[PDB]
């Protein structure tokens, strides 16, 4: 009983590093985006949303994990 | 379009000129590349190897002494090289090995001769794959 709130707090601790997959993931997209525009400057509009689109796919999945922290925080 | 426009060119006689074709296979610096109907626009320097041309008909096999493969962005592949080759007639091991040992002997001479000698060593050892 004196442990379950402490256990939910360490559960918020372990449920944190899953945004690491965010921290890598969106990275390579912009990396690819630079290699998207380095070898072909006149196609960048073609990829300027289409890169950042996948951004919101990856970011939100990173933004999955910590809100599962937060309802485990409360 | 479906298929591909092939333009094979040699300094004495261009063999194919605007022919419709299915598959080509050709040796580039990054390895042996096959090109099909559409392709990325790509310039590949051609190490001396073998080029195989497959059509609606069969695939004709050539030895090739090197050059450039160039994919025009309307999916028209041109090959610009030097030497043609029949099925198997134009190469014989009696002319290969007896000259090849002399070429390896020239490979120990002074630098300009020895470099061309080593090049011909590499070309004859590539021709060993045509010996097959």
């Amino acid at each position: 009983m004196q442990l379950v709130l402490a256990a939910k707090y360490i559960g918020a601790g372990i449920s944190t590093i899953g945004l690491l997959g965010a921290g890598i993931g969106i990275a390579i997209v912009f990396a690819a985006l630079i290699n998207g525009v380095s070898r072909n400057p006149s196609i960048k509009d073609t990829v300027f949303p289409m890169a950042i689109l996948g951004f919101a796919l990856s970011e939100a999945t990173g933004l999955f994990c910590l809100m599962v922290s937060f309802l485990l925080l409360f | 379009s479906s298929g591909l426009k092939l333009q094979f060119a040699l300094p004495h006689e261009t063999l194919y000129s605007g022919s419709e074709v299915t598959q080509v296979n050709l040796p580039a610096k990054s390895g042996r590349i096959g090109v099909l109907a559409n392709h990325v626009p790509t310039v590949e320097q051609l190490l001396p190897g073998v080029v195989e041309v497959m059509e609606g008909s069969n695939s004709k096999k050539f030895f090739i002494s090197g050059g450039f493969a160039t994919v025009q962005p309307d999916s028209q592949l041109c090959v610009t090289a030097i030497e043609a080759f029949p099925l198997e007639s134009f190469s014989q091991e009696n002319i290969k090995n007896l000259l090849a040992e002399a070429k390896k002997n020239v490979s120990s001479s002074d630098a300009r001769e020895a470099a061309e000698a080593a090049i011909q060593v590499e070309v004859l050892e590539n021709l060993q794959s045509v010996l097959k």
Binding site: - | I82, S89, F90, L99, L127
Partner: protein
């Protein structure tokens, strides 16, 4: 192997390949046209700024 570093330029590289394929020709079909392709008789004389000369060397 380091022919780009030590030996020939790339056009000359494929030219040595051309003489090698023409040297390993079939002696039945090594025609006079292919031997015409290997008949080098051009001479070069590097002139200087004072219109000087070297001897004509068989390239």
């Amino acid at each position: 192997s380091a022919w780009r570093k030590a030996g020939i330029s790339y056009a000359a590289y494929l030219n040595v390949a051309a003489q090698a394929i023409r040297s390993s020709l079939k002696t039945e079909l090594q025609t006079a046209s292919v031997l015409n392709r290997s008949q080098t008789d051009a001479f070069y004389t590097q002139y200087k700024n004072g219109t000087a000369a070297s001897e004509p060397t068989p390239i």
